[PDB]
From a paper:
The process of eukaryotic DNA replication begins during G1 phase with the loading of the minichromosome maintenance (MCM) heterohexamer comprising Mcm2–7 subunits into head-to-head double hexamers with double-stranded DNA passing through the length of a long central channel. This topological loading requires the Origin Recognition Complex (ORC), Cdc6 and Cdt1 proteins. In budding yeast, Cdt1 forms a stable complex with MCM before loading. We propose that Cdt1 stabilizes a conformation of the MCM ring in which the Mcm2–5 gate is held open to allow duplex DNA passage required for helicase loading. To understand Cdt1–MCM at an atomic level, we determined crystal structures of two non-overlapping fragments of S. cerevisiae Cdt1 spanning amino acid residues 1–438 and 495–604.
The fragment comprises a pair of well-defined domains corresponding to the N domain (residues 14–298) and the M domain (residues 299–430). domain (WHD) family and is predictably similar to the geminin-binding M domain of mouse Cdt1. Further division of the C terminus of Cdt1 showed that fragments containing amino acid residues 271–496 and 495–604 interacted with both Mcm2 and 6, suggesting there are multiple interactions between Cdt1 and MCM subunits. By docking the crystal structure of NM Cdt1 into the Cdt1 density, an MCM interaction can be modelled, whereby the middle domain of Mcm2 is sandwiched between the A-domain and AAA+ domain of Mcm2 and extends to contact the A-domain of Mcm6, following the outer perimeter of the MCM N-terminal domain. In summary, Cdt1 makes extensive contacts with the outer perimeter of MCM, notably being sandwiched between the A and AAA+ domains of Mcm2.
Residue numbers in the entry: 294 to 388, 398 to 433
Amino acid sequence: AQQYYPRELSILRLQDAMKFVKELFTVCETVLSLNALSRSTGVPPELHVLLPQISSMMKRKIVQDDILKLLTIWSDAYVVELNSRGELTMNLPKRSRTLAFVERAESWYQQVIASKDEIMTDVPAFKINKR
């Protein structure tokens, strides 16, 4: 076109992905914080239990891969634990987190579009290995 060629179009796609993971982080923050209060151990239910809550707040069906995008931006954002059956459980780490995430999200976005190759259109899911 005039202003936007394939590379620029990919950047625009990525910006929507940035907007997505930023909102998703905030939603995970409210859900995990609230659910971590329900039990004496301070440990929330498995992630698959909390996904309907996360989905309703996001007004869209959120899956585990969406959640893992957050760790790509901030690896120490949450603590990841795999149980006996391999079911994923996420939890807040032991001590503003929202501001910290946005800064890293911005910095991550900067480094992606900075170099002149091919631009990814979405945040890749963080890779989790077996315990």
